[PDB]
Design a protein around this nucleic acid. Sequence first.
RNA 1: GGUGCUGUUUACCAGGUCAGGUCCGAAAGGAAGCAGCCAAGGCAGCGCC
Length: 69
Amino acid sequence: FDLNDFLEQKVLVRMEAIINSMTMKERAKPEIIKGSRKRRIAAGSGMQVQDVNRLLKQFDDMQRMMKKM
RNA sequence: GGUGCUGUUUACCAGGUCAGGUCCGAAAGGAAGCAGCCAAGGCAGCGCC
């Protein structure tokens, strides 16, 4: 279960904007995304790093709730 | 080395285009620009010089 998936699922259009600013590898291995990449993605989708982390925060809980069934 | 071809490879770090999103604006409209893609580079094979 990756971010390509999480995508298939005003605050929603902005949640796509962010993933839309990532690369295939970042969607395939979210963990590889540290500060530098966060920065690239925030500016790339007119957001703020906090916003991204937020989106990253969600996927994590969503993924975590995927390793429980 | 250069050059052509082919395969491969490359988040951002003065290429181009720029979905999506963002910014400025009452608006008309401007602006920057991620991913992609094209280009360019890297690693190689073959040919040519």
